[PDB]
């Protein structure tokens, strides 16, 4: 593994969110700025196949401070605390190159009025639904068209702080200000059903959280679990959310990112004739500004929690192929962790993840 730390030339601005979409890692933040880097350019620089002086975003444009970015190969969903835009046609489908903003179609999808604020935006590509969490309801919109499908109303005392996508598309999970984990069954139509309410389970702080569950959808990770002062823990979605493993004790009140790699890896132990399949989690250790990468099978870190930033990590995103981790903080420095086969082994075909979901 190589760590490339690349200070951004963005003056006094801040990057709050990022997303790996298509060939790009897309950064977005204050002043409405969006900047797109080719993932492979950063990886190639990390392995010295190209030089550092050539690094530069392929496309930058300006949309309010941006806190949310998600989407697919046809639409970027870009959100402030009060507005959500859709930028469609952002990727030239014939060349796999990002278009300039001048070829992009942009639409104001949603606006809320203070005191309301958007606490999270999550996109479930299998349901075809975007979830907009507001401080107190969850709104369900059809993707692209953005027709309103339904609305989940929850208690006045329960602010929905963050949402967690189910890779199988059967559920949506919310963590609340009054310490609950709420699990809803969701249908593609937008109809919904509360199926699990776990109370006094998590301590949420007034932050934008970035949490993803395991690609097999069997583990829900929790920052600041107050079951099993507080710790980062893994809950078994198939065994009544029992704690299966604790990763960090104590967790930091400033930790807001815990994301699984989408890959399911197999690494042989050739000397002993055996092999191990495992998942990877990126989060922080007890100190803000650390990055910890955790092998869920060995239940060990890949390396000592590494102090990379003087400030809390704002967001992290794995590459789609599982071999690169991108991270950003208020230090305005893009962190690229570029793994190799000799580090991790081989990402398994999606058949193997799909078999474990069923």
């Amino acid at each position: 593994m190589r760590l490339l730390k690349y200070p951004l030339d963005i003056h006094n601005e801040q990057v709050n969110a990022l997303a790996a979409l298509g060939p790009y890692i897309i950064l977005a933040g204050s002043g409405g700025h969006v900047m797109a880097w080719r993932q492979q350019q950063l990886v190639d620089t990390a392995f010295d196949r190209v030089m550092i002086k050539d690094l530069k975003p392929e496309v930058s444009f300006q949309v309010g401070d941006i806190f949310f970015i998600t989407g697919d190969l046809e639409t970027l969903y870009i959100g402030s605390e009060h507005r959500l835009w859709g930028y469609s046609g952002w990727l030239c489908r014939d060349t796999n190159n990002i278009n300039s903003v001048e070829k992009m179609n942009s639409k104001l999808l949603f606006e809320c009025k203070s005191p309301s604020t958007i606490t999270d935006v999550k996109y479930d590509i299998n349901l075809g639904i975007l979830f907009v969490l507001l401080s107190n309801k969850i709104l369900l919109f059809r993707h692209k068209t953005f027709d309103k499908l339904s609305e989940i109303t929850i208690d006045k005392a329960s602010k929905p702080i963050t949402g967690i996508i189910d890779p199988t598309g059967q559920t949506f999970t919310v963590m609340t200000s009054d310490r609950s984990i709420l699990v809803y069954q969701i249908n593609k139509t937008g109809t919904h059903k509360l199926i699990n309410k776990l109370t006094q389970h998590v301590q949420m702080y007034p932050l934008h959280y970035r949490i993803s569950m395991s690609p097999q959808a069997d583990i829900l990770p929790v920052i600041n679990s107050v079951k099993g002062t507080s710790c980062t823990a893994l809950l078994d979605r198939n065994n009544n959310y029992k704690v299966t493993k604790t990763l960090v004790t104590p967790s930091s009140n400033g930790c807001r990112v815990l994301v699984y790699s989408p890959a399911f890896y197999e690494k042989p132990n050739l000397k002993k004739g055996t092999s191990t399949r495992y998942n990877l989690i990126a989060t922080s250790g007890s100190t803000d500004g650390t990055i910890l990468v955790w092998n869920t099978k060995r239940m060990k870190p890949l390396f000592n929690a590494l102090q990379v930033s003087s400030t809390a990590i704002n967001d992290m995103s794995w590459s789609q192929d599982g071999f690169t981790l991108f991270a950003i903080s208020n230090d305005a420095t893009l962190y690229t962790f570029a793994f190799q086969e000799k580090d991790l082994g081989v990402a398994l075909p999606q058949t193997e993840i799909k078999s474990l979901q069923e």
């Binding site: 760590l3 490339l4 730390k5 200070p7 690094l55 870190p301 390396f303 590494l306």
Partner: peptide, 11 residues
Amino acid sequence: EPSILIDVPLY
């Protein structure tokens, strides 16, 4: 401001 590029050995 210059980039840092470091090798990080794994366990």
